Paper text:
Pseudomonas species and other aerobic bacteria have a biotin-independent malonate decarboxylase that is crucial for their utilization of malonate as the sole carbon and energy source.
The overall structure of this hetero-tetramer is similar to that of the malonate complex, with rms distance of ~ 0.4 Å for their equivalent Cα atoms. The electron density in the active site of MdcA is smaller than malonate in this structure, and a chloride ion is modeled in one of the active sites. These two amides form the oxyanion hole for this active site, stabilizing the transition state of the decarboxylation reaction. The pyrophosphate group of CoA is located near Arg180 of MdcD, while the 3′ phosphate group of CoA is exposed to the solvent.
Numbering used by the authors:
A (entry chain A): 7 to 554
B (entry chain C): 1 to 97
C (entry chain D): 3 to 278
D (entry chain E): 6 to 268
The structure:
């Protein structure tokens, strides 16, 4: 295997001997970790650091911050999610310089600041599956810093309900002479104590028994107490004006209280329309605790999960018919495989957002705050490569016996006319435009493009954009449901009846929904506690949501 | 915080009274009493400053082509969105009938 | 002879849906809001009145000489052909959509089979609002295509819809059809048995009958009660297009003639044919 | 002689009838905030050629007469920079009920009225119907229901319907007692203006100090209202689509929608 053709293998080889003394086998000493990190990583390395929507490799993540900024500099950080503080710390300390991410958690006012100071450089804002894809083209990685639960001395890792992005972050690293380090909660000397092998040992280079269990974020869990009756009003319009009017059989729900509202009034408002089993049978969704009554009411046939919501593990093991579980009994999430399904195999996507302009362009990026896109761009677009027909997919066709006209994925943008802080949601210009000029961004960071949205859903009503004959007509429809926001003030009210009759928009009246019928009494579960007892004690909410 | 006053052409005095919501952050409280015939007098106390123009549009739309009963409406707003506000006004107006 | 008598093909002997299918070109008939849609009157059950599934009106698309058309037939059996909230909106909304077809290039014709007692008094104000919208849409449409009104009887055409009949370009009638504003009983009621007799059937037809209305110019065709002959006359009038100057815009000629008449005494069937 | 007549002189100034109009009509051009306005009203004429039309009824003459006055103003502003608005003061107890009337085609007379008003509305003329008294059946179809906007005075004398309870009870086969009974349970059957309002056919109701003869206070609120109503009309859709907003007309709206889906 010739020298000039195997240079990154000899480089991996050089790196593994500068820790051959410090490590016995694949096992690394917890209190000599930072030493190893300075030996296995080189300055300028492309590093994948597990900051997943949920699973965080917090021990590795912290130890890498207490590295010496003289030995490791100009690191290129590749993280699906930037939630933890240690993460952006790598940049102020001068250890890391470039960042390629997808989801920016709370860290959004920071990333923006650190960037404006010239400490952090951004490649672009991706959408998970896009960023994974890069790892075998543009951004082949050098080091992978991931996390699992258990590992044997051989290298086999059990990632369990928290598999998430690991199989996609590790594979392009292991097979390109890169270096894979996985922190685990426990090493077993006897391998038959590994409930399952999620990552084969031949992908892993070293394992570390962490100083404490890897941090799990309940990213998607929503307290049903915070669901107001305005949420419940939109939830009803979604179910009758969209799910039912198009016969949606499968879907994904974007994070947010708005879609939590939908999940929780299915077994009541959905039931009162005799829709149990007629819609929403298949899901590409995280195991949302707000979905529990819908499972028990017997609505949900299948659920394939991106990750796991902390506390839902035990509930899921007890529901093998619904979730995808291993032969060990526990969940096997797969954010790459779920994300893929959420694009190609699912009828609809529905999610919230922070801003929309008159053209329907949606984004989370606002003044000096670089929010992430998460999974929204992958599921918030009409998958142009899809060919397989489905009922809902076909309903979008204008002339249904034009054989050349293809169908469309339902892409719903579900938002109140106003963000709570008295800012309007529908604005004249996206903030994202100005953030682009001041970041040398080549094109404004839009999460979901206006031409991709089929339904705009508001407490005002539904705009069936998929029916728009021209852009001017689309803008007309958006303003009609846009309330008293600056976009909605463009709308001339005498024009509403026309738009209603023509079925361009639907008011709640048009759906047989009296607005004042929206109350929390429709919520199947009214609190986190009520969620625990639909689950019959199986859901163990994390301390954050407990009141007992 | 600021105090706003409104007035609209209305019909005959409404028939009863009504209370809807509470002054918690993000919600509002609406008092509906019967008032002087021909006039609908609204009084708004909001925690949001310079929203006056916003409340104006909300109300014009609410009463567009539908003449309301003559009422006295006392609103106490702790930064509720125009969506939530509109919703509680309708709850309130429904209960008055 | 006897074979002819045994072979009569009466038009009035058909119900609303039968008339509709019978006039519209063979095979084009497509009913909108059919009885299986179950779009019925929301005001009848509460009053202890049994509702009809299509509220007493048949609205159907199709062709009239390969020309796109819409047809609204009222069913006389149901509440006398009275229009209610839903009944009315089926007719008005159809004329409104025919008009919007003309504005988008499609030359849609509107054929109305009127067998009605006017506003359904059990839905009084909602049916009367509807007729106003029916009227409005008839005018709006006759800027592009004529509306042919067919009044064959038995019930005839009264109340608000007699005013809607007036608005129409052409008004084809049979002998049995009546066309008045107020029904005979209603006049007797308000004006006295001497001023008008609800039991005097030959008198009632003598003034408001299809024959009388045609001989005085308040009607454009005096059809026999034969299926084929009615379709024939229908197709023919749609083919003449919009009338040069229709009865509605003759306001001063009639005002002139009325001014001439000595109103001091009760005009008779013949007196009315002379005055025009 | 009638609320119509009282309110015509109070809004138009001219209380005498034009020459050329039947004595039962009252036409008069004027201005309303610098906008050209023609006031039309049907009033009583106890010396009407037809006896069955001497208490304000809309009969043969009143019918065609209206078709005259509107078509008159239609061709005037055929060219004018601003089509003049038509304000209909509605206060007509009924259609004329009679032999003389039916024999001469009273249904056709009132069709001339509807056609006129309608063609006017369609051309750009702003119609406004001011319900100051009674507004019944065919009479109101002719004089009033072609309006771009309806305004009623809030008052017990203001009633909308299609037949007197005497005749309605007869045709229907009910007692006057069960009508008034039913008229509370079925809003479209009721005569009062509150029940009419619930049909969302009125753009505005406004109460007054003295309905019989407006006070200077009334006449200013009414005049302001017409001004506002007239501005809502201008530049917008000319159809009667505005009459579909109410929950009691829920079905009217649903039918028009289903019609387009299957069209
Ligand atoms: C239409 C009319 C002339 C026909 O009378 P006819 O030929 O003698 O037939 P009938 O009197 O048997 O009428 C039959 C049915 O029509 C019904 N009907 C007629 N007009 C009706 C109306 N406007 N509302 C409700 N029902 C009506 C009658 O109640 C009767 O009911 P039934 O079928 O349960 O027996 C007569 O019903 C009439 O005078 N109608 C009044 C029309 C009118 O003036 N309209 C005012 C409202 S704008
Ligand atoms: Cl996800």
């Amino acid at each position: 295997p010739p020298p000039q053709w195997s240079r990154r293998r000899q480089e991996k080889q050089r790196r593994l001997e500068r820790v051959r003394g410090l490590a016995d086998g694949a096992v690394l000493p917890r209190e000599g970790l930072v030493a190893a990190l300075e030996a296995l990583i080189a300055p300028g390395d492309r590093v994948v650091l597990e900051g997943n929507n949920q699973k965080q490799a917090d021990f590795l993540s912290r130890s890498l911050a207490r590295v010496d900024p003289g030995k490791l500099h100009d690191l290129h950080m590749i993280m699906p999610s930037v939630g933890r503080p240690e993460h952006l710390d790598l940049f102020e300390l001068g250890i890391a310089r470039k960042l390629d991410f997808s989801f920016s958690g709370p860290q959004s006012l920071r990333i923006g600041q650190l960037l404006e100071d010239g400490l952090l450089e951004i490649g672009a804002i991706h959408t998970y599956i896009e960023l994974y894809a890069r790892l075998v083209v543009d951004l082949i990685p050098n080091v992978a810093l991931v996390a699992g639960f258990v590992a044997d001395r051989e290298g086999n890792v059990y990632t369990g309900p928290s598999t998430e992005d690991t199989p996609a972050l590790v594979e392009p690293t292991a097979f390109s002479d890169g270096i894979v380090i996985v922190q685990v909660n426990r090493i077993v000397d006897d391998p038959r104590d590994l409930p399952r092998v999620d990552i084969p040992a031949s992908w892993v280079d070293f394992v570390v028994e962490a100083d404490q269990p890897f941090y799990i974020e309940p990213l998607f869990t929503r307290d049903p107490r915070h669901i107001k009756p305005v949420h419940v009003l939109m939830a009803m319009m979604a179910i009758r004006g969209i799910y039912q009017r198009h016969n949606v059989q499968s879907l994904n729900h974007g994070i947010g209280f708005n879609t939590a509202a939908i999940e929780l009034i299915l077994p009541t408002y959905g039931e009162s329309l005799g829709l149990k089993g007629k819609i929403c049978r298949h899901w590409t969704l995280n195991p949302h605790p707000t979905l529990i009554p819908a499972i028990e009411s017997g609505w949900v046939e299948s659920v394939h999960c991106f990750g796991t919501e902390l506390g839902m593990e035990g509930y899921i093991a007890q529901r093998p018919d619904v979730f995808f579980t291993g032969r060990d009994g526990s969940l096997r999430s797969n954010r790459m495989f779920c994300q893929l399904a959420g694009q190609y195999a699912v009828d609809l996507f529905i999610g919230a957002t922070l801003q929309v302009d008159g053209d329907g362009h949606s984004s989370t990026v606002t003044r000096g705050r670089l929010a992430g896109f998460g999974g929204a761009p992958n599921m918030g677009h009409d998958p142009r490569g899809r060919r397989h027909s489905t009922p809902a997919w076909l309903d979008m066709r204008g002339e249904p016996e034009a054989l050349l006209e293809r169908g469309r994925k339902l892409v719903v943008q579900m938002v109140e006319t106003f963000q709570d802080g008295g800012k309007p949601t529908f604005v004249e210009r996206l903030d994202a435009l100005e953030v682009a000029r001041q970041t040398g961004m080549p094109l404004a960071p839009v999460m979901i493009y206006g031409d991709d949205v089929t339904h705009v859903l508001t407490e005002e009503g539904i705009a069936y954009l998929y029916k728009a004959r021209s852009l001017e007509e689309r803008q007309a429809m958006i303003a009609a449901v846009a309330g008293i926001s600056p976009i909605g003030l463009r709308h001339d009210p005498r024009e509403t009846q026309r738009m209603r009759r023509e079925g361009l928009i639907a008011l709640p009246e048009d759906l047989g929904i009296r607005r004042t019928d929206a109350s929390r009494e429709l919520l199947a579960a009214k609190s986190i506690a009520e969620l625990v007892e639909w689950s019959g004690g199986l859901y163990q909410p994390p301390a954050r949501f407990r009141s007992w | 915080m600021e105090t706003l006053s409104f007035e609209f052409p209305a019909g005959q005095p409404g028939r009863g009274r009504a209370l809807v919501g509470c002054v918690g952050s993000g919600d509002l409280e609406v008092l509906l009493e019967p008032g002087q015939p021909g006039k609908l007098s609204i009084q708004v106390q909001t925690s949001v400053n310079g929203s006056a123009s916003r409340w104006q549009h909300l109300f014009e739309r609410l009463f567009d082509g539908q003449t309301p009963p003559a009422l006295l409406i006392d609103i106490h707003d702790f930064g509720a969105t125009p969506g939530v506000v509109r919703l509680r006004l309708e709850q309130g107006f429904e209960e008055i009938g | 002879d006897v074979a002819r008598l045994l072979a009569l093909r009466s038009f009035t002997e058909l119900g609303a849906r039968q008339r509709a299918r019978a006039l519209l070109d063979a095979g084009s008939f497509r009913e909108l809001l059919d009885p299986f849609a179950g779009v019925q009157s929301p005001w009848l059950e509460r009053q202890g009145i049994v509702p009809q599934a299509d509220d007493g009106v048949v609205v159907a698309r199709g062709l009239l000489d390969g020309q796109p058309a819409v047809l609204a037939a009222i069913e006389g059996a149901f509440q006398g052909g009275s229009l209610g909230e839903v009944s009315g909106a089926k007719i008005a909304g159809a004329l409104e959509l025919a008009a919007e077809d003309n504005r988008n290039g499609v030359p849609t014709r509107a054929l109305l089979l009127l067998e009605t007692g006017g506003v359904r008094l059990q839905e009084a104000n909602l049916g009367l609002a509807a007729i106003a919208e029916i009227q409005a849409a008839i005018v709006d449409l006759q800027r592009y295509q004529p509306v042919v009104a067919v009044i064959a009887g038995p019930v005839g055409c009264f109340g608000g819809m007699s005013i809607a009949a007036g608005l129409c370009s052409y008004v084809l009638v049979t002998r049995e059809a009546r066309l008045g504003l107020n029904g005979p009983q209603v006049i007797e009621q308000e004006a006295g048995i001497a001023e008008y007799d609800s039991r005097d059937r030959p008198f009632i037809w003598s003034l408001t009958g299809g024959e009388q209305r045609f001989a005085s110019g308040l009607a454009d065709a005096y059809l026999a009660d034969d299926l084929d002959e009615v379709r024939t006359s229908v197709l023919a009038y749609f083919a003449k297009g919009l009338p040069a100057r229709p009865r509605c815009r003759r306001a001063e000629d009639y005002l002139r003639r009325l001014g001439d008449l000595d109103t001091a005494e009760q005009p008779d069937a013949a007196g009315v044919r002379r005055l025009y | 002689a009638s609320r119509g007549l009282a309110w015509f002189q109070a809004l138009a100034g001219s209380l005498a009838p034009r020459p050329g109009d039947p004595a039962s009509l009252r036409v008069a051009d004027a201005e309303l905030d610098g906008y050209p306005v023609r006031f039309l009203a049907v009033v009583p004429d106890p010396d009407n050629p037809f006896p069955r039309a001497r208490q304000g009824e809309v009969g043969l003459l009143e019918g065609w007469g209206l078709a005259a006055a509107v078509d008159e103003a239609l061709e005037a502003d055929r060219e004018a920079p601003r089509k003049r608005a038509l304000l209909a003061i509605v206060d007509v107890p009924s259609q004329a009920y009679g032999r003389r009337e039916e024999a001469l085609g009273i249904h056709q007379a009132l069709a001339g009225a509807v056609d006129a008003y309608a063609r006017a509305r369609l051309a750009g003329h702003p119609l406004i119907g001011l319900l100051v008294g009674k507004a019944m059946s065919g009479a109101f179809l002719a004089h009033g229901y072609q309006a771009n906007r309806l305004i009623a005075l809030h008052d017990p004398g203001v009633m909308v319907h299609a037949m007197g309870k005497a005749a309605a009870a007869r045709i229907t086969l009910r007692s006057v007692e069960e009508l008034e009974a039913l008229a509370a349970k079925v809003p479209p059957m009721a005569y009062d203006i509150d029940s009419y309002a619930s049909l969302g056919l009125l753009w505005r109701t406004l109460p007054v100090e003295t309905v019989e003869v407006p006070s200077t206070a009334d006449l200013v609120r009414v005049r302001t209202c017409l001004g506002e109503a007239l501005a809502d009309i201008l530049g917008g859709p000319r159809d009667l689509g505005g009459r579909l907003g109410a929950a009691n007309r829920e079905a009217s709206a649903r039918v028009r929608r289903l019609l387009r889906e299957q069209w």
